[PDB]
Design a binder for these strands. Structure first.
Lengths: 138, 189, 143, 62, 101, 144, 72
RNA sequence: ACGAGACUCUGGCAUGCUAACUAGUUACGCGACCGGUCGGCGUAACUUCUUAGAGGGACAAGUGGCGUUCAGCCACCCGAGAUUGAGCAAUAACAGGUCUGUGAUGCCCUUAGAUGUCCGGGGCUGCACGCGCGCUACACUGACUGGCUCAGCGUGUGCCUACCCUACGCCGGCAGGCGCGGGUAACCCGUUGAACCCCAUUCGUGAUGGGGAUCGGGGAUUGCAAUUAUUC
């Protein structure tokens, strides 16, 4: 049983399976704070202290994430967690608390529950990159 | 109640310049725990100036060779040298950086002569946005040249260059190039 | 700490001009037969404290390092990690200090030039043979 | 020259050989009776304040 | 065997869709329990060649693309009924294969 | 109580497993400790001198994270950048013999061992001991 | 021929290493190596030794960027 | 009227729909302490992540400013998105290139070289040289076991031919050989465990562990011979 909420950034995508619990947060065999980078750690911690530990104390959400790159796997765990919390609150308890948390998250970061649409652009022949071109002599 | 990293506060900072305060963002809703957020600042005007000043400052850190595209390394070298300036001074690093930017952002310098002309240069006002751009660029470049061909490593040249720019020491590249820009502005009346 | 006796500044293994400031295994690379990886393996096998330089150590360490160097087969170093394995004429054995076998491996090059061989004469003319193309080499300071 | 700030009140347009200078009307918040044309450098919005240690010079206009 | 597999391979989505609809229509004519048409990922055969038959000109590359679409249906029916079902109505462009499941 | 493998900071966790391997001695004593260059892509000296013990602990970590790993796979977790000299760099598989000998050191020793049909089986002794090591690391100086 | 920087714990090294250095808040290997004219390796070794002596607390160290913070 | 645009494929949003033991989310027999890690399983909540099928969605649509008070431009609550990237691309032309694609071609080769069969060997891999694309370096933002964490496009069992990707154990620090085979493929490689971020031990301003003909010797592929040897 999941809140069916998902969350993406770049080709990466994360979903928070949700159940009734006491706010224990886990990410693919690990909790939310033992993630390897230890410098992107603040990016993962953004929600849990952006709105407080109390709101993350009555719901158990396990965030499964599949995608490329370290940082692109981030911005998916955090957004999935925040949007899963907002959807859980919206569909189960009420909207007033849900509306409050949504306003808080949007004010801190408007792209906290909306996906980042940008994707890597294709490459065109006669150049290595999307917009870079091969050097030639005049 | 948002603090930069874990201990820097955003209530002890004050601009007291009135010239460039809307293009510096440290006390407003733009407060965050990690100087790494990507964002859509560089995809439109009237939205590029809403990036937090520390975010822009860490964004412009990486440059030259493979060093570009290593924003996480910039976060590390920014937590470093900021611990260093806070231990060297004891003051709040954000206010010191704001002082360095106010002291380093050029006010007036030369461009083309009004309607038309390219033989010489004519002095004009520098926009606050371009002046913070120039201040950040001089800070980064002076730091990386101070590290260049030197025994001392990174996270030092940033620290000393920033602290001299805040204080006005001529060993700072940012404010010496500032005074250079106003001297060209004066000499090109 | 300060050692009160027998501090050396010009270290010497065998007629080699090497620095005494250099770290151990960073100065003994001057051997034209072995060095770097082989040196690291030899010193790690000889049970030397790497955390020390080449001056704050006793003479016995250098003595045993030299003995294990000149006798690779006596102290468990395989016949694959070294550069005198069997070749033309007779198989070479024992790697000795400095150009003790580098002269031996240049005299075979001398033989190759003296026999008038295509590879040999191209070695004599200064044209590398192991697979080196020639489109820009020999253009600066050529005759 | 006395130091007196000026605030942007209208973005007149672009000038310069490569079109980098910007003509903009700037007003001093001391009498609101003076509104001088200033050429400025760099990205300039509408409504900011330009620090002016020098004001005896004017931008080409009219 | 009881488990029969119907494989539909088609480069054209329209003909594949029509064939799948016709097969489901036939399996609806006679009461037969059917699993929904499983759509596997399409295969994009991107191959790039040089436009000019010589070396003269700018670097111009034709990027030819062939897309292959895959449908699978699994049924519980005897071989005679499946055989009757398959050849009731088809349209050229789709390849139909009957396999043992 | 109970504490598993994955909820422990992997750095000091693999350090603790290496120390446990040194203290145990139940394994086949390594016969090459510094005579090899380890990975094919790597033409630079090893340092720790414990690469057999630490690589055995790493192998155990990798079969606990992903059951069924062996040599051919272990090469794929121990592959790395290969600087081809004047040419640019590529990816290179490690040493299949080194990982194979590490597995044979692990194999049949009652914490982990690889079969001949596919997959990895984990004995109660090994999993209990490793979970206890993880819990001791967590509650000793990583959690109060 | 080669530039000379002290690679040993010498009289100049032992001088102003445990009494005058803590008076300066900036305690990093580069500053030490410049002050007493040694290499970076010896400065890192000296700060590691004085940390092992239990004088000054640590903040961080990745490979050569190490921070010491005083208490007085 | 053609071209532009429109068009098509793409990149982004639908918890709306047709639905999927070649995909997972839900189904539990150590509950390892008296509420928990699973792809260590301790061997029938159904399409939410995955899969592109049919519809929908964005139109400068609302507000404000400027503007023939038009066409439009700028700024914003809102919204997935307020300019995705490509494909195609007119009239005319160039003595642009291509006879090195062929009875698709208009001229010479007919008298034993007429190529329709053929080559044992070397040529553009070798040179006093000037040039053009790109890589490895330009530092102590760099390195000296790398210890732990991931995806993306997509290719792969062949009848002109063992001429594939290879999972797993054996032989060795090594190129490589043996076996059982998994894969004709969302069925196996593959959950495609590289680049990276770390470090309470080791580089320190060299000409060098920032580096290459690191000169020369140890290597070899169920397939004509690795010769200024394009594999190692």
């Amino acid at each position: 049983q999941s809140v069916q909420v998902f969350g993406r950034k770049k080709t990466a995508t994360a979903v928070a399976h949700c159940k009734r619990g006491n706010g224990l947060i886990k990410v693919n065999g690990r909790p939310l704070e033992m993630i390897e980078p230890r410098t992107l750690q603040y990016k993962l911690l953004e929600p849990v202290l952006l709105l407080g530990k109390e709101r993350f104390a009555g719901v158990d959400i396990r965030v499964r994430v599949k995608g490329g790159g370290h940082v692109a796997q981030i911005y998916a765990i955090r957004q999935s967690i925040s949007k899963a919390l907002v959807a859980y609150y919206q569909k189960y308890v009420d909207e007033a608390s849900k509306k409050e948390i949504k306003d808080i998250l949007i004010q801190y970061d408007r792209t906290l529950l909306v996906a980042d649409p940008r994707r890597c652009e294709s490459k065109k022949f006669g150049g290595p990159g999307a917009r870079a071109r091969y050097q030639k002599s005049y | 109640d948002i603090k930069l990293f874990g201990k820097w506060s955003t209530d002890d900072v004050q601009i007291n310049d009135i010239s460039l305060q809307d293009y510096i963002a440290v006390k407003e809703k733009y407060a965050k725990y990690l100087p790494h957020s990507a964002g859509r600042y560089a995809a439109k005007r009237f939205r590029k100036a809403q990036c937090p000043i520390v975010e822009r400052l860490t964004n412009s850190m990486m440059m030259h060779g493979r060093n570009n595209g290593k924003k996480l390394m910039t976060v590390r070298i920014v937590k470093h040298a900021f611990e260093i300036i806070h231990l060297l001074t004891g003051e709040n690093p954000l206010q010191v950086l704001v002082n360095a930017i106010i002291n380093s952002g050029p006010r007036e310098d030369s461009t083309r002569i009004g309607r038309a002309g390219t033989v010489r240069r004519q002095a004009v006002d520098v926009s606050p946005l371009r002046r913070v751009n120039q201040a950040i660029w001089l800070l980064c470049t002076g730091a990386r040249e101070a590290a260049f061909r030197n025994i001392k490593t990174i996270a030092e040249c940033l620290a000393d260059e920033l602290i001299n720019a805040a204080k006005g020491s001529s060993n700072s590249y940012a404010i010496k190039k500032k005074d250079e820009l106003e001297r060209v502005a004066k000499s090109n009346r | 700490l300060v050692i009160p006796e027998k501090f050396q500044h010009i270290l010497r293994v065998l007629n080699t001009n090497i620095d005494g400031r250099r770290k151990i295994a960073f100065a003994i690379t001057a051997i034209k037969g072995v060095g770097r990886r082989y040196a690291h393996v030899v010193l790690r096998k000889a049970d030397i404290d790497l955390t020390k330089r080449a001056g704050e150590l006793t003479e016995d360490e250098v003595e045993r390092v030299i003995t294990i160097m000149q006798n690779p087969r006596q102290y468990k170093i395989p016949d694959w990690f070294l550069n005198r394995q069997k070749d033309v004429k007779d198989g070479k054995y024992s790697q000795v200090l400095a150009n003790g076998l580098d002269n031996k491996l240049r005299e075979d090059l001398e033989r190759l030039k003296k026999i008038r061989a295509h590879r040999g004469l191209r070695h004599f003319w200064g044209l590398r043979v192991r697979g080196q193309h020639t489109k820009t080499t020999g253009r600066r300071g050529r005759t | 020259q006395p130091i007196k700030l000026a605030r942007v009140t209208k973005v007149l347009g672009r000038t310069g050989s490569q079109g980098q200078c910007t003509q903009v009307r700037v007003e001093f918040m001391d009498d609101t009776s003076r509104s001088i044309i200033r050429n400025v450098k760099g990205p300039v919005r509408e409504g900011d304040v330009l620090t002016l240690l020098e004001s005896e010079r004017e931008a080409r206009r009219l | 065997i009881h488990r029969i597999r119907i494989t539909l391979t088609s480069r054209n989505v329209k003909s594949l869709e029509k064939v799948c609809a016709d097969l489901i229509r036939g399996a609806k004519e006679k009461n037969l329990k059917v699993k929904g048409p499983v759509r596997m990922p399409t295969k994009t055969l991107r191959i790039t060649t040089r436009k000019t038959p010589c070396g003269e000109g700018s670097k111009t590359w034709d990027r030819f693309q062939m897309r292959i679409h895959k449908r699978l249906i699994d049924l519980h029916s005897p071989s005679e009924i499946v055989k009757q079902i398959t050849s009731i109505s088809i349209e050229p462009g789709v390849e139909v294969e009957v396999t043992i499941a | 109580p109970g504490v598993t493998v994955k909820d422990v900071n992997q750095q000091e966790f693999v350090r603790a497993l290496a120390a446990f391997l040194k203290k145990s001695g139940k394994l086949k004593v390594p016969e090459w400790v510094d005579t090899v260059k380890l990975a094919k892509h790597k033409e630079l000296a090893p340092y720790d001198e414990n690469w057999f013990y630490t690589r055995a602990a790493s192998t155990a970590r990798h079969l606990y994270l992903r059951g069924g790993a062996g040599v051919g796979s272990m090469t794929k977790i121990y592959g790395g950048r290969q600087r081809n000299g004047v040419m640019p760099s590529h990816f290179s598989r490690g040493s299949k013999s080194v990982a194979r000998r590490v597995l044979q050191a692990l194999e049949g020793l009652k914490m982990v061992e690889k079969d001949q049909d596919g997959g990895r089986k984990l004995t109660p002794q090994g999993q209990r001991d490793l979970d206890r090591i993880a819990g001791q690391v967590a509650a000793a100086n990583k959690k109060h | 021929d080669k530039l000379n920087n002290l690679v040993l714990f010498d009289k100049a090294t032992y001088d102003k290493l445990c009494k005058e250095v803590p008076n300066y808040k900036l305690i990093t290997p580069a500053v030490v190596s410049e002050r007493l004219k040694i290499r970076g390796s010896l400065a890192r070794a000296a700060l590691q030794e004085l940390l092992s002596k239990g004088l000054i607390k640590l903040v961080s160290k990745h490979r050569a960027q190490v921070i010491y913070t005083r208490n007085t």
